[PDB]
């Protein structure tokens, strides 16, 4: 309420420019601006306001006639969008100045509650700024300039934002509960409404394949009113939130039925049979699949009184609840979220592993190639391979080659030959521990999990610093610091591990690389190669030895601890990171009581009932299972 003279010229310049970038944003989001006539601007009359609206200083409040200007919904959405953009501009400015979000405002620590995304912004402030912006843009719209807001373009985001390796999770009964004969019934309550499937699955059903994409599953998909055994066909109708799907299987007549809240679902024809001709095939088990942000519940009818629509449909027809005559809860198996290393199947679609015996002039080798390369539907993604047995470092660290030195040494070697025509930049060579479970489509050496434990004295001076990770590997491309064609001779990275000192070193082509690692005592290192296949032949593990270094077999096998001759016993095979595995949900969990005691005492977490499980440990893989 001051003329521009005494008014803070910085504030007035902020006003003028923020309006200038305001019209710039108007044109940037795609709005078309057109003046019908400068005289059209002139004809509409400016109000001169009485003393109530009139300020004190004299900067006369002059609003133009805004009564007759109404905006189309696209223009109103434009107003909302540019208000969001202004909020983003202000937040970014304050962040650059150094302000951060806090649940209350603190000027001393430069903390504001308003530094949140516009969707979370509080309604009062957001609508106040929005209506000020609306009046500002309406002024120009009534100033003879029509502002054609660009037509809104709908975008389908598929509501998928999960982990890179998981798009759905599959829950099923245990394989041992497969029903070969009889009439069986279970229920599936849909807490949400979306990407969900429910039905019956054979024991061999895979956890990373969509239900009904292959023959192993017979499922109903109520998101799109479809049925899935081998592909999809239209069937039934769509559920809503809170609906109940009753699944019936009759092995005697080899039929399947689905009911939605009691009513029997029927296909395009009048048939009530979702699936009508299938073999018994090792029985069927209840199964469901849930997508991103989907919640379900599966009731096997252990307590028949808890079934919502069994009496309405299923009871009089002779179908039994799946858990009708059981004394304990059905064990539930669900798709494992953490990938694990396992042997390459002999029937794998893409990966082939060939074991080559060592000759007099050649060391034993394990060649990794591609079955599906040079053809269609060939996956071009990074595969993580390892050897099935680890090298264990010394438990306490001390502070023609010679036979005596070779006997007394604790240094072991292997090699990886990247074949000609395979891109070295797509191949990583080195060691991993049993903790490595990071399946990423894009793997780089800078994102390996790592930490540093720094131990100091009472004063605070660091007396030791330990670097710990699960990935100690180098890239063949960077190791090949000079770039060439690589087909003159296949590239050969040599990995050397000194277990007596826990020292990991690498050799490029007879030249020692600058990259080295220091590991803790008792560390178990699995030889590992990460490769993105650009060739039918990918790489080759080589179990030979170099001067003054024992072969890998000597370190791996106690019975071969003193044998310098390289060996590849059948126990040593090539494993790869895969997601085709199931997890067993525990039948019983720890009982934890959590409660807010008071504003001063905090949050009490209490657990008093002992619970134990019996763990079976695999010595090879340094892992344990229930």
């Amino acid at each position: 309420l001051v003329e521009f003279s005494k008014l803070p010229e910085q504030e007035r310049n902020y006003n003028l420019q923020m309006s200038l970038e305001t019209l710039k944003t108007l044109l940037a989001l795609g709005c078309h601006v057109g003046i019908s006539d400068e005289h059209a601007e002139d004809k509409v009359k400016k109000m001169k306001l009485p003393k109530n609206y009139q300020l004190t200083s004299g900067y006369k409040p002059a609003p133009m006639d805004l009564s007759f200007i109404k905006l189309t919904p696209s223009q109103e959405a434009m107003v909302d969008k540019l208000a969001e953009n202004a909020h983003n501009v202000w937040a970014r400015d304050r962040i650059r100045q150094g302000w951060t979000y806090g649940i209350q405002q603190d000027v001393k620590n430069r903390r504001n509650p308003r530094l949140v995304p516009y969707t979370l912004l509080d309604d009062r402030t957001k609508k106040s700024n929005k209506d000020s912006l609306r009046e500002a843009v309406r002024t120009l719209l009534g100033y003879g300039y029509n502002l054609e807001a660009p037509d809104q373009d709908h975008a389908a985001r598929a509501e998928v934002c999960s982990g890179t390796g998981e798009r759905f999770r599959i829950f099923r009964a245990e394989k041992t509960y497969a029903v070969k004969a009889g009439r069986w019934y279970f229920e599936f309550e849909t807490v949400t409404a979306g990407d969900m499937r429910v039905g019956w699955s054979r024991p061999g059903c895979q956890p990373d394949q969509e239900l009904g994409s292959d023959e192993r599953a017979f499922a109903f998909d109520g998101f799109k009113a479809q049925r899935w055994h081998q592909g999809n066909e239209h069937y039934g109708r769509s559920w809503q939130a809170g609906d109940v799907v009753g699944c019936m299987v009759d092995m005697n007549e080899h039929t399947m039925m689905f009911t939605l809240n009691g009513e029997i679902l029927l296909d395009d024809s009048g048939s009530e049979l979702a699936f009508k001709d299938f073999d018994v095939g090792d029985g069927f088990i209840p199964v469901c699949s849930l997508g991103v942000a989907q919640v379900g519940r599966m009731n096997f009818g252990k307590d028949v009184s808890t079934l919502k629509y069994f009496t309405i449909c299923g009871l009089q027809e002779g179908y039994e609840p799946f858990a009708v005559n059981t004394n304990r809860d059905i064990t539930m198996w669900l798709s494992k979220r953490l990938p694990q290393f396992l042997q390459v199947p002999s029937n794998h679609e893409h990966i082939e592993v060939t074991r080559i015996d060592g000759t007099i002039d050649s060391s034993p080798c394990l060649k990794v190639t591609q079955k599906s390369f040079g053809s269609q539907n060939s996956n071009t993604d990074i595969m993580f391979y390892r050897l099935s047995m680890p090298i264990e470092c010394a438990e306490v660290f001390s502070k023609r080659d010679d036979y005596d030195f070779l006997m007394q040494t604790s240094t072991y070697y292997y090699s990886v030959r990247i074949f000609p025509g395979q891109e070295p930049a797509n191949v990583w060579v080195g060691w991993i521990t049993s903790d490595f479970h990071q399946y990423d489509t894009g793997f780089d050496l800078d994102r390996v999990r790592t930490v540093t434990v720094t131990l100091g004295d009472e004063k605070g001076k660091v007396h030791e610093s330990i670097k710990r990770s699960n990935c100690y590997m180098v890239c063949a491309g960077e190791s090949m610091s000079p770039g060439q064609g690589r087909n003159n001779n296949g590239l050969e990275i040599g990995c050397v591990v000194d277990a007596a000192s826990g020292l990991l070193t690498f050799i490029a082509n007879g030249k020692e690389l600058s990259t080295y690692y220091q590991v803790e005592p008792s560390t178990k290192l699995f030889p590992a190669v990460f490769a993105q296949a650009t060739s039918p032949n990918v790489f080759q593990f080589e179990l030979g030895r170099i001067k003054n270094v024992m072969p890998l077999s000597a370190g791996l096998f106690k019975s071969e601890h003193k044998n310098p001759v390289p060996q590849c016993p059948p126990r040593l095979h090539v494993q790869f990171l895969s997601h085709v595995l199931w997890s067993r949900m525990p039948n019983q969990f720890l009982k934890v009581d959590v409660s807010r005691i008071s504003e001063r005492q905090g949050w009490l977490v209490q657990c008093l009932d002992p619970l134990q499980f019996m763990s079976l440990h695999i010595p090879e893989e340094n892992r344990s299972v229930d």
Binding site: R169, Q588, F589
Partner: protein, 49 residues
């Protein structure tokens, strides 16, 4: 203090780190994958003008 990180609309709770806990089997919520927390980090990116 760690309570200052609560988002303005949410309320602070102490809960299980994992999805599944001790419940009745037929009342247990089976959960699919969850969306990534995009609102967790607020990076204001304006339209370039």
């Amino acid at each position: 203090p760690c309570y200052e990180a609560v988002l303005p609309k949410e309320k602070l709770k102490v809960e299980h780190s994992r999805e599944y806990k001790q419940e009745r089997t037929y009342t247990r919520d089976l959960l699919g994958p969850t969306v990534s927390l995009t609102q967790a980090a607020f990076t204001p990116i304006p339209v370039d003008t």
